[PDB]
Design a binder for this molecule. Sequence first.
Ligand SMILES: CC(C)CCC[C@@H](C)[C@H]1CC[C@H]2[C@@H]3CC=C4C[C@@H](OC(=O)CCC(=O)O)CC[C@]4(C)[C@H]3CC[C@]12C
Ligand SMILES: CC(C)CCC[C@@H](C)[C@H]1CC[C@H]2[C@@H]3CC=C4C[C@@H](OC(=O)CCC(=O)O)CC[C@]4(C)[C@H]3CC[C@]12C
Lengths: 553, 553
Amino acid sequence: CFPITLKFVDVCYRVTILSGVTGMISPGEFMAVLGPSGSGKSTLLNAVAGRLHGSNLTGKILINDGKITKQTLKRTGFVAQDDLLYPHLTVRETLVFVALLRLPRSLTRDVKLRAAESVISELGLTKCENTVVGNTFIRGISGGERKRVSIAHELLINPSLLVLDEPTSGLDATAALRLVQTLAGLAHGKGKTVVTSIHQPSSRVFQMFDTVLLLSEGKCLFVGKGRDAMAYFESVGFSPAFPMNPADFLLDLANGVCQVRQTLVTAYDTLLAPQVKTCIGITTCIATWFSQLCILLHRLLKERRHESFDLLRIFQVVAASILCGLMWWHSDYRDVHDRLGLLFFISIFWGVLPSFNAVFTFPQERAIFTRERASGMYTLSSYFMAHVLGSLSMELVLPASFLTFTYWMVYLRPGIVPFLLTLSVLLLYVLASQGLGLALGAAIMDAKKASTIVTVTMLAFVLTGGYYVNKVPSGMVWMKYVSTTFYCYRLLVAIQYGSGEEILRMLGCDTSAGCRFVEEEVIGDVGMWTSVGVLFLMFFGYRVLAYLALRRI
Amino acid sequence: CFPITLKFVDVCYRVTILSGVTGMISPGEFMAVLGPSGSGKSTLLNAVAGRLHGSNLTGKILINDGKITKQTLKRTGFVAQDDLLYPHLTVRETLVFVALLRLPRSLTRDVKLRAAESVISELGLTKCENTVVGNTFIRGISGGERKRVSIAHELLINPSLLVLDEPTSGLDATAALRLVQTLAGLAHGKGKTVVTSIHQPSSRVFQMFDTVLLLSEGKCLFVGKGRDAMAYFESVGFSPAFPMNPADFLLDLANGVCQVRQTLVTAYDTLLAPQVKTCIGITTCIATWFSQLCILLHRLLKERRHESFDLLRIFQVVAASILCGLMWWHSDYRDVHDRLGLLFFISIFWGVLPSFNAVFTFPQERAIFTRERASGMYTLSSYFMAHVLGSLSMELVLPASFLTFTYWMVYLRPGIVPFLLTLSVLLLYVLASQGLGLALGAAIMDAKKASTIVTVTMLAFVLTGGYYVNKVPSGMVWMKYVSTTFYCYRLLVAIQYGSGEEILRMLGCDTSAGCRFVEEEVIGDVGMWTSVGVLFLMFFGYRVLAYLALRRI
Ligand SMILES: CC(C)CCC[C@@H](C)[C@H]1CC[C@H]2[C@@H]3CC=C4C[C@@H](OC(=O)CCC(=O)O)CC[C@]4(C)[C@H]3CC[C@]12C
Ligand SMILES: CC(C)CCC[C@@H](C)[C@H]1CC[C@H]2[C@@H]3CC=C4C[C@@H](OC(=O)CCC(=O)O)CC[C@]4(C)[C@H]3CC[C@]12C
């Protein structure tokens, strides 16, 4: 193994939440960053892992007596408090995909699979490797297993310095003890440098750590051996008045509640601090981008299959198709108004549903994307393109089945050519609306606010679709040309009626009002090819804007 | 005070989570119910407070050496783990409303207010009495303060038996310690019989219970004084091998892991269990219903104001109004098709918004309602009617402003009489659609499923509203007669055009298709009075069905 002797001196995160903190941890030591809420333990462990930087951070952080560099980040892993795992991917599949993404591409796929399986077996996940990870919504692995998977995500890289952040927070006592035992075995058996910040450790848990460092409102008050806390603190003059837990005594004293803070921090600076101070390729790029794309597509296929194929959504589409095939059951080709209403309702449904359902995919996965992009698992372009391709594959199945039922139940324009034409138009419109939803959900990451914004914009698109109101004011017809629903409706009308020659012959005109009812509603101001071109342009441009918005964050 | 002594013997909850649990708690005893997860602490606490009953519970529970009666429940409280508080009510207002609903009506309102203020001061909430309670969404009081408010809710009845199911779960160490201090003061200063199922207490927290009782897989492992656990267990033969927290050691022994369960259970049954066993007016109804209605209306006014006037909902309504006033800006009266499209769009918007928003009011409060219905705070009829009245008052402001802007930015039928006619029709339609949403959200209690069902049924209503398709199949025309949107659309058409005499004179009509396009659209198959009566009938019947569904649960 490549050992890491991590050190930190005078690290003060002056915003203060950190000041006057020093010490070190040697390889094979199981660290304990204890302290109460707001004492800077999480801040200290984020800073020591390279997450925090800039003028807000002072002091020195040394890795093997050297400044933290890129190779350091390649050799140290950080387990954040928030477990950002894909709910519908099993533990084995999740960590296999992570190993494929973050391990160097020089390693063969079989070698990455073997490493992933070894990591599964080492962390005790082999009993639930085939169990779906799940989340609070869909049942899956337990909290301890979820945190173990989160650690394993940072263990496939094989780091000697593993900096966890509250791994037993919100965990069962037995499960927390088992996880702390696993961390201690990693520090001892694997010879790793494990640094963890346990919120409120238990008794056996406190017995597990080989080295304890606790702060006090941003000031490190005691750094030393795990079992040397009691002796040092009774030497200072602070002793339990009852059978107090060493961890509980340590935390309660951190607040200054004993029998305080200033006298004992001075004592630490005069007795223990001196002791701890004296103790111290273009084709290759294309290939890797495409492999990242493939791995991300395979890992998000389950997410799309449970998101785009939601049973509630499936029932929604089925009910819409049944209502379409019953309301327009064997609809006459000559009934211009009813057929146009059907086409406009199809446009409304398949513009509202895809955009609305897409507007959440980016806000709900933003945390996972940021966590896995800051670690270098994949680039933004590859992740965004894989998301776009998977959603393209999965958001057309429901409209395709809907149209397959409706077109033949309604008795629309017969033949196979107009069925493929209207199916292509409907799928392109669904893709364009979905891209608009993606752009709106990426521009701002508030899921509810983005939902309201896409609702407002598609309400505007529908009201300008050319059906509800035909005599648009001269100062408002401009918006009609930027509405996806308008172009879809015009394409559907052109497929069903063409230039309206046959329907105009049926009407007779080529009454003034009757002619107008079939003149502007059937023969629009946009050609059949111009509408297709603008639909494709919007399909590309909305996703381009979504990618730019992702680049903004 | 009225001292109360719980005396439970052989309390086993088959179909096991409890078996052979024996013990008692006297006034002034701050008993703790310790044990690992699933050992039966919560189940025993619920059963000992009267929550659990039936053949599933076997054994004997005595209150003041007598069987639990209805009068006892008026003297025993129960602080459940789930804090069911209205987020937008301040602590003072929340607990004043709770005191009004809970304390007997013979007490004057000023006396109830004084009792509520005294309870605020006693539990340390006087520093945050004016602070909005909030929840995970809207910021407010802390978790410890939230649990304190729950305890106060269970304390306004003034019970001498407080039964706190996991009150420090999710609480900070200092917050949990302070809450346990408050509970100990309640047990000692107020002479109350306080029993709690502490999950994982700290050292001070463990020191603060006068007596403790442990669960081990449903068996009473040790009952006695809080400070006698260590001595009794070293007498048995179990001693800490390290400095171990008495609570932590107690829980670890309860898990059976110790350097076990069966032999020590036998030892308890041999030594300590024998010791415990040896120690073992219709006008008044109307007045109270109306006072409950008024109090619930005042308590839910803030919820409706921050729910029916959501900034996202307000933005949606404003955007819809602006799009109505722009798309149909200075709309001509003679333009029958565009006017009918505007009316149908109004019907769609104001049948979808309230129906969708109503399917969440009942589920998101259901638990709270149950928590405040089994305890006898109010009856189902009063709560449901207060909810209906508040939603009636608060769900008409947005449609009223929307129509006020649209009617005069679109140039519909001028004058004041048709404006109030269309406003009354729109508000009645909003009420009917909201009642449909309430009925569908009460029939099934899942918010997402209710939303999907209500949107499917409103999709059916809109597709049969008489605008999208006019030549309805003979086997499908029955649905339009049960569609709220259809009746609203017909009423709007009758307001804007009446019998269509003026527009027919404008057209000169009496081609045939052009004449029918207006005759079948403007002149429907339902009269104005018939549509109004059916709208009112549906408004009443949907809420009746919602009340019946609430009665089902
Ligand atoms: C015939 C044309 C006009 C149809 C176009 C749809 C519109 C009528 C708009 C106006 C009211 C809109 C609704 C207003 C408010 C909401 C709440 C909103 O709730 C959320 O933010 C849910 C977030 C989540 O699910 O996580 C979901 C969209 C929805 C139903 C909107 C969906 C689109 C609606 C139905
Ligand atoms: C053309 C006319 C009839 C307008 C109605 C068509 C669409 C605008 C509707 C039909 C189905 C609706 C969906 C039905 C169910 C829901 C679940 C809902 O999720 C919730 O439960 C959110 C709860 C919350 O808002 O807090 C989010 C909106 C959504 C997808 C709805 C969005 C609006 C949709 C697409």
